[PDB]
Design a protein around this nucleic acid. Structure first.
Ligand SMILES: [K+]
Ligand SMILES: [K+]
Ligand SMILES: [K+]
Ligand SMILES: [K+]
Ligand SMILES: [K+]
Ligand SMILES: [K+]
Ligand SMILES: [Mg+2]
Ligand SMILES: [Mg+2]
Ligand SMILES: [Mg+2]
Ligand SMILES: [Mg+2]
Ligand SMILES: [Mg+2]
Ligand SMILES: [Mg+2]
Ligand SMILES: [Mg+2]
Ligand SMILES: [Mg+2]
Ligand SMILES: [Mg+2]
Ligand SMILES: [Mg+2]
Ligand SMILES: [Mg+2]
Ligand SMILES: [Mg+2]
Ligand SMILES: [Mg+2]
Ligand SMILES: [Mg+2]
Ligand SMILES: [Mg+2]
Ligand SMILES: [Mg+2]
Ligand SMILES: [Mg+2]
Ligand SMILES: [Mg+2]
Ligand SMILES: [Mg+2]
Ligand SMILES: [Mg+2]
Ligand SMILES: [Mg+2]
Ligand SMILES: [Mg+2]
Ligand SMILES: [Mg+2]
Lengths: 127, 142, 46, 62, 239, 201
RNA sequence: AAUUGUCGGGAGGGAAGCGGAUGGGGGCCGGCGAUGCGCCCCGGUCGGUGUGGAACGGCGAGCCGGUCCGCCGAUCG
RNA sequence: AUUGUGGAAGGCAGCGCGCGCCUCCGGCGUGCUUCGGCAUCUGCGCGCUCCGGACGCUGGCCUGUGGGCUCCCCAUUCGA
RNA sequence: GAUGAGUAGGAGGGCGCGGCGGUCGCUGCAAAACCUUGGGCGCGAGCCUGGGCGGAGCGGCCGUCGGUGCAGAUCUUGGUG
């Protein structure tokens, strides 16, 4: 399958937004939280501090949610759901759900080859 | 369907057993429809197999690379067992392509679905060839 | 009773692009030609 | 910087659609969205706006 | 023989050609109107160019005539000003803030034209330290309108890429081309108010070469206030 | 018919004569008489079924009206000019410029006998044109073109003979200028205190 | 999980961590990166206008169609 | 020096060559002219261009000591 | 076409947890939980997936509901420097 997308993917930022002071404290997890403190230097955006996520970082709508291979992911749990991508094989690629058995993955992979549907994790748990 | 199609779309566009949604209702949201009479499997009033009296079905038929071309009968909207006018085709692609163009566009059945039907026929026909013999090209060039 | 059924142009600097200037001011071509011809006579005269 | 109020954006709110989920009302809105756009009739524009309004803004007439 | 065309298709097809015919006629009618307009604007621009040269030579003759007779010739007072905002939007006293808004100078280095009269001059006097202005020459007016000229159409900023934009708004006032717009501004014609308001305030760049001192008046060696004909020198570096 | 252009250009896109002048030169007045006082009106100049239908409509790029122009030749470079190669395996060697090919590249020769540089194509951006000129009037390279340097290792004897034929006519001219043979046999290099932006070539 | 031992990599002139930018060394990734397409003949394989049937359809009694089977002609795809 | 966003339109604008002849850097007919010139005659057909947003050519490399990386450790300049 | 600061405060659109009414699925050919210098998506809340461990359950979607989201409270209980 030849991906239909042609515009290059431009990531405004590739680093993640780490919660402030999650390095200092084990109990403070890395998932982002907006600092609400009155004196918070991060909230006040002093230079040399952690950056906060804002809408300006939004990616181009034409390349948003596109994988590096040039397709968009759709999660499939069986062979029937795979057939939904027959007419979108140049736009959407399939990914087999993490909990599908190896026996049922062989059926999905074989069916995807007939439909020319890209499978992102076709080598999963077959050894 | 027995009621106007526009009314049906207002009802089933939010929730129906054939609606497949993934990745929530944000920007990541992806929506598909999997009713057998939806050529592109798209969740739209144009392609919906539930909210249109005149719909096109193209899918593999049984064995021997046969392709089923079924259209919904306009006067049988209240008879599910007799709603489909099936036509099993087992000839060359060119012959099948003409039949689809005749039963979709020439008779003014669903001229807006002529392009989708031919692409649907092209996709179904190609998959039947690969099943019989197996994958031989990766189709990755270009 | 319905009425009949019904992109931004990249702005170019007319001070530099000749065709763009002529589109706005067709007389600019005559002014350009006269200035060039007038200068040529003065250079030749000197 | 630009000397404007709220970045030049409007601070007024009006109904651009009905708040109701009535399927029949939404079909009427679709019908009169088309009529207002393709005719330019002032009557159609007024009808479209009033279909958006709340119950108290659509009082009964004896 | 052949599938019978349904009545609905025939009705739609019949109306399409009628719309196409009427639509096709517009190109022929519009094309002839455009052809005549090109000759019109060509002659007007030729007329305007001659007028500008005559005025320049007329002023020189009068000054020499007064010199020969031993008297003085007082030049006519400038009718047109170009105003540029040189200070930011921080710490604005309320009166200055209102006046700059009325002049449509809402951003530093924005510029606009302004007709000269006692009402406007006294407003300008009250925002002296926040602006610099002077008398723009023909070159400055041409460059500003041609390079950074945008028209206000339905409260939207539209680049003056074609004369159609000028005619869409100022057509009823006789201004159909950018040359007419330049002539109206420079001479401060009867329709200056509409022509000038039609122009979006000019978004000039920071001056190439910088400023001397924005905090002092131009007379003191600064950059604020009336610099008369020297506004042109600044317009070159900011346009 | 007309033998020369009616309207010479003062600059690119502006003719020397106005529309009124061109009307006289075009002869439309004469044409009007011959056609009953009217300018003649002319008339405008008067498949296989697909084997596969794509699901996604193909998009074709919009028309671009800009057409590439031939590569320009630097004024410093004239036939017989000595060039200095700035890159590649022959960096620093002094070669003789023969002509510019249709591709825009320069055709140069060592000559091969003096410095071992054969008939080769060198991009203009990687050479410096000096002020030394060697006569190449007797050199014939009309047979050489872009296809002569196209791939399809032992060098065929045909090209070796072709090199000598072109080389032979050039050696006599080089031998005429004293110390020119040694000049073309030595590579150019920068020594201590040598500033490229001040060097005269 | 806090916390601890051990082995392995690495750093350390009175804290360490952290933001941004590269580099070095690691680790990881073949949808990490294609190999097809068009036109020719050799062979093989598989189907082909006009009349017969079978089960149906679009448009609204009547016109207008395709699918499948068989028979002729046609002799290509 | 930075940059090509768009992918429906050969549009708009300015010209050239033909549709009449000459000795061809130019010359030949009306109207106007400041006597230099002029959108006064300047229509059609086919083309060109600073003209409704970048196209073209060539090479390298493609299971390698290659390429890529948002992952890991570390170093350095700036910030903190 | 214009435009982008924000404590107290207001509102919108979304993310996540556990049930219920429905619907579509997964699982001893290995579910949940947990681990990972595997990879990717989203501005972000989060999501998807490889490998490992584990050995019996679980998830998506629509609606609807709630004892539904923690770094602090000399917070509580337990554990540990
Ligand atoms: K460039
Ligand atoms: K490679
Ligand atoms: K650092
Ligand atoms: K469920
Ligand atoms: K994981
Ligand atoms: K729920
Ligand atoms: Mg990211
Ligand atoms: Mg404070
Ligand atoms: Mg797993
Ligand atoms: Mg801003
Ligand atoms: Mg605000
Ligand atoms: Mg201040
Ligand atoms: Mg601005
Ligand atoms: Mg400088
Ligand atoms: Mg200063
Ligand atoms: Mg002060
Ligand atoms: Mg631990
Ligand atoms: Mg592009
Ligand atoms: Mg804000
Ligand atoms: Mg849950
Ligand atoms: Mg870890
Ligand atoms: Mg979930
Ligand atoms: Mg509970
Ligand atoms: Mg609670
Ligand atoms: Mg806690
Ligand atoms: Mg807190
Ligand atoms: Mg405590
Ligand atoms: Mg305790
Ligand atoms: Mg203790």
């Amino acid at each position: 399958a030849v991906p239909l997308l042609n515009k290059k993917v431009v990531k405004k930022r590739v680093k993640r937004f780490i919660r402030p002071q999650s390095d200092r404290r084990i109990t403070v997890k890395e998932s982002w939280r907006r600092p609400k403190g009155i004196d918070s230097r991060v909230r006040r955006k002093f230079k040399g501090c952690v950056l906060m996520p804002n809408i300006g970082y939004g990616s181009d709508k034409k390349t948003r949610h596109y994988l590096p291979n040039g397709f968009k992911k759709f999660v499939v749990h069986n062979a029937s759901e795979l057939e939904i991508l027959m007419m979108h094989n140049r736009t959407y690629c399939a990914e087999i759900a993490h909990n599908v058995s190896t026996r049922k993955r062989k059926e999905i992979v074989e069916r995807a080859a007939q439909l020319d549907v890209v499978i992102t994790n076709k080598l999963a748990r077959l050894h | 369907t027995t009621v106007p199609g526009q009314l049906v779309w207002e009802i089933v566009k939010k929730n129906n057993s054939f609606l497949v949604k993934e990745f929530g209702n944000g920007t990541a949201g992806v929506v598909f429809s999997k009713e057998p009479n939806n050529l592109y499997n798209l969740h739209s009033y144009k392609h919906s197999g539930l909210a249109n009296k005149k719909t096109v079905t193209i899918q593999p038929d049984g064995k021997d690379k046969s392709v089923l071309l079924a259209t919904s009968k306009t006067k049988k909207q209240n008879k599910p067992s007799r709603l489909l006018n099936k036509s099993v085709m087992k000839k060359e692609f060119s012959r099948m392509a003409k039949a689809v163009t005749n039963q979709v566009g020439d008779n003014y059945y669903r001229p807006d679905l002529k392009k989708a039907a031919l692409a649907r026929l092209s996709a179904v026909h190609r998959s039947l060839k690969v099943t019989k013999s197996g994958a031989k090209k990766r189709n990755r060039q270009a | 009773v319905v009425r009949p059924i019904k992109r931004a142009t990249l702005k170019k600097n007319p001070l530099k692009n000749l065709n763009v200037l002529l589109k706005l001011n067709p007389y600019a071509k005559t002014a350009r030609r006269m200035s060039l011809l007038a200068e040529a006579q003065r250079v030749k005269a000197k | 910087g630009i000397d404007l109020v709220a970045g030049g954006k409007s601070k007024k709110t009006k109904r651009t659609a009905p708040k109701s989920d009535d399927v029949y009302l939404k079909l009427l809105v679709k019908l009169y969205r088309f009529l207002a756009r393709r005719t330019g009739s002032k009557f159609n524009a007024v009808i479209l706006k009033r279909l958006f309004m709340s119950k108290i803004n659509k009082p009964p007439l004896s | 023989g052949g599938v019978v065309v349904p009545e609905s298709v025939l009705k739609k097809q019949k109306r399409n050609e009628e719309w196409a015919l009427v639509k096709k006629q517009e190109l022929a009618v519009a094309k002839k109107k455009s052809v005549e307009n090109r000759k019109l604007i060509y002659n007007r621009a030729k007329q305007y160019a001659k007028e500008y040269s005559e005025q320049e030579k007329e002023l020189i003759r009068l000054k020499r005539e007064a010199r020969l007779k031993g008297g003085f010739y007082v030049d006519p007072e400038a009718k047109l000003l170009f105003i540029i905002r040189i200070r930011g939007i921080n710490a604005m006293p309320p009166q200055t803030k209102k006046i700059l808004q009325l002049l449509r100078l809402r951003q530093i280095f924005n510029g606009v034209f302004l007709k000269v009269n006692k009402a406007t001059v006294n407003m300008l006097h009250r925002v002296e330290p926040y602006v610099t202005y002077g008398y723009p020459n023909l070159k400055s007016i041409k460059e500003l309108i041609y390079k950074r000229g945008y028209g206000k159409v339905d409260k939207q900023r539209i680049a003056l890429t074609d004369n159609a934009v000028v005619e869409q708004v100022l057509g009823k006032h006789g201004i159909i081309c950018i040359e007419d717009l330049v002539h109206e501004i420079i001479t401060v014609g009867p329709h200056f108010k509409e022509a000038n308001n039609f122009l979006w305030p000019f978004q000039l760049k920071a001056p190439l070469g910088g400023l001397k001192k924005k905090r002092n008046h131009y007379v003191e060696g600064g950059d604020a206030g009336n610099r008369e004909n020297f506004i042109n020198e600044l317009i070159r570096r900011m346009n | 018919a007309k033998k020369t252009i009616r309207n010479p250009e003062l600059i690119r896109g502006v003719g020397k004569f106005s529309r009124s002048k061109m009307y006289h030169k075009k002869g439309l007045w004469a044409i009007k008489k011959k056609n009953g006082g009217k300018l003649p009106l002319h008339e405008k100049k008067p498949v296989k079924p697909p084997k596969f239908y794509p699901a996604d409509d193909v998009k074709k790029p919009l028309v671009n009206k800009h057409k590439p122009k031939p590569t320009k030749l630097r004024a410093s470079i004239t036939p017989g000019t000595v060039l200095i190669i700035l890159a590649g395996r022959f960096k620093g060697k002094r070669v003789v410029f023969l002509k510019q090919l249709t591709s825009g590249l320069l055709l140069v020769t060592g000559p091969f006998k003096l410095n071992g540089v054969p008939l080769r194509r060198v991009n203009q951006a990687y050479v410096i044109g000096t002020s030394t000129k060697v006569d190449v009037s007797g050199v014939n390279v009309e047979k050489i073109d872009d296809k002569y340097f196209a791939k399809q290792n032992v060098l065929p004897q045909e090209k070796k003979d072709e090199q000598k034929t072109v080389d032979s006519a050039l050696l006599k001219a080089i031998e005429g200028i004293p110390e020119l043979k040694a000049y073309l046999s030595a590579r150019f290099s920068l020594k201590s205190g040598m500033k490229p932006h001040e060097l005269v070539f």
